[PDB]
Amino acid sequence: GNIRVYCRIRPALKNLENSDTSLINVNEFDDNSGVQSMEVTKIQNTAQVHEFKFDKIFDQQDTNVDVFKEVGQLVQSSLDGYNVCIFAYGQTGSGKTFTMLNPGDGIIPSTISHIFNWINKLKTKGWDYKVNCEFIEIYNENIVDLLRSLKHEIRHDQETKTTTITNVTSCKLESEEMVEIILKKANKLRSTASTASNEHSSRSHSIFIIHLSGSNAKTGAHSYGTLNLVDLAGSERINVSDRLRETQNINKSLSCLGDVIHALGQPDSTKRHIPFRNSKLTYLLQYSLTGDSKTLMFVNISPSSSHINETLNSLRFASKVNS
């Protein structure tokens, strides 16, 4: 299968943000290069420009609907039996949740809408599809069910190349509206909101799993594909001088994730040593990563000079992958 990396620059914050000490420049997509380039410069030293290439770059103009236009084609693949992974990577505040979960806008919401659209359309070709979904968070390497109102163990099935988690609430999606309630919950909890709880969310990975089961009599065919939409824990480098535990956790979690992606993109990713088991995340997702699977990595960045440094890390992490 294939791997891709997008960069998304969010618009600046009305008051507490500026770019007087830094400069981000994005160039127009090219063929000869078949990439899109960007440029990052720190004022303190204008002779050192950091270049970064990607599959695609979204700036402050591209809205959420603007982004899905590029993502819809990837998602559709599940109707064909492929598994898909989508990760939002970046520092707290870069806009990861916004991109994933923004009401009606988000990758998740849009993704759902999009499949139904197709499902409803495939009925004519003799296809009947069923959709189920799970919603958990990985926090300190422990699995947590975000759909409950309990020990969870990962079951991998090699006959099927499918995975399951014990004791995890699963939900039937017969319509967009069905999830749409949860999706509210979800976003608010992760908001700047007074009562919300981002301190925790910031420190954790939230995973939205979706499974499409399709069968067709007039062909007698079957299709099964899983989509994993990841709202990664904040990537901010912490000085480090519980919270320490929480810290180390993340680092290995992200690093591992980066090791794994990079390896999958290598020309000899077959019998290459891939740290799947190194983290709960990659362990959980190995089937949605290996083989024919499609992975999209989204790198979220802030445009203000105030984060120029994390911004650099973020692009380095991204860069490492794509290579």
Ligand X SMILES: Nc1ncnc2c1ncn2[C@@H]1O[C@H](COP(=O)(O)OP(=O)(O)O)[C@@H](O)[C@H]1O
Ligand-binding annotation for 271, yes or no, is no
106 binds, among ligand X, Mg ion, none (CB under 5 to 8 A by kind): none
211 binds, among Mg ion, ligand X, none (CB under 5 to 8 A by kind): none
For ligand X (CB under 6 A), the number of binding residues is 12
Pattern of binders to Mg ion over 79-108, x per CB under 5 A?
-----------------xx-----------
Window 70 to 99, contacts with ligand X (CB under 6 A): 90, 92-98
Ligand-binding annotation for 213, yes or no, is no
CB 51 within 8 Å of CB 35: no
Query: For the chain, what is the total number of helices (H) and then of strands (E)?
Result: 9, 14
Query: Toward ligand X, which CB reaches closer, 83 or 311?
Result: 311
Query: Toward ligand X, which CB reaches closer, 83 or 206?
Result: 206
CB of 237 to Mg ion, least distance (A): 17
For residue 181, the SS3 value is coil
- Taking each helix axis from N to C end, the angle separating 243-265 and 308-322, rounded to the nearest 10 degrees, works out to 40
CB of 300 to ligand X, least distance (A): 6
228 binds, among ligand X, Mg ion, none (CB under 5 to 8 A by kind): none
6 binds, among ligand X, Mg ion, none (CB under 5 to 8 A by kind): none
Ligand-binding annotation for 148, yes or no, is no
Largest CA distance in the chain: 67
The CA distance from 100 to 191, in Å, is 13
11 binds, among ligand X, Mg ion, none (CB under 5 to 8 A by kind): ligand X
95 binds, among Mg ion, ligand X, none (CB under 5 to 8 A by kind): ligand X
| 10 in contact with ligand X (CB under 6 A) | yes
Ligand-binding annotation for 124, yes or no, is no
93 binds, among Mg ion, ligand X, none (CB under 5 to 8 A by kind): ligand X
Ligand-binding annotation for 98, yes or no, is yes
> Per DSSP, which regions of 55-178 are E strands?
56-58, 84-89, 127-138, 143-145, 154-157, 162-165, 171-173
Ligand-binding annotation for 121, yes or no, is no
Query: Toward Mg ion, which CB reaches closer, 214 or 234?
Result: 234
CB of 64 to ligand X, least distance (A): 7
CB 1 within 8 Å of CB 82: yes
* 211 Rama sector, left if φ>0, alpha if ψ -120 to 50, beta otherwise: beta
Run of H or E including 224: strand 221-231
Query: Toward ligand X, which CB reaches closer, 4 or 96?
Result: 96
Residue nearest to ligand X (CB): 95
Which CA distances in Å does 287 have to 84, 156, 171? 9, 9, 21
Q: Where are the alpha helices (DSSP H) in the chain?
A: 64-75, 96-101, 107-122, 176-179, 182-189, 198-202, 243-265, 280-289, 308-322
Ligand-binding annotation for 316, yes or no, is no
The CA distance from 76 to 239, in Å, is 42
Ligand-binding annotation for 176, yes or no, is no
Per DSSP, what are the bridge partners of residue 299? Answer: 7, 89
CB of 251 to ligand X, least distance (A): 17
Give me the residues that bind ligand X (CB under 6 A), please. Answer: 10-11, 90, 92-98, 192, 300
Residues at the binding site are 2, 4, 8, 70, 93-98, 159, 184, 295
Q: Which residues bind Mg ion (CB under 5 A)?
A: 96-97
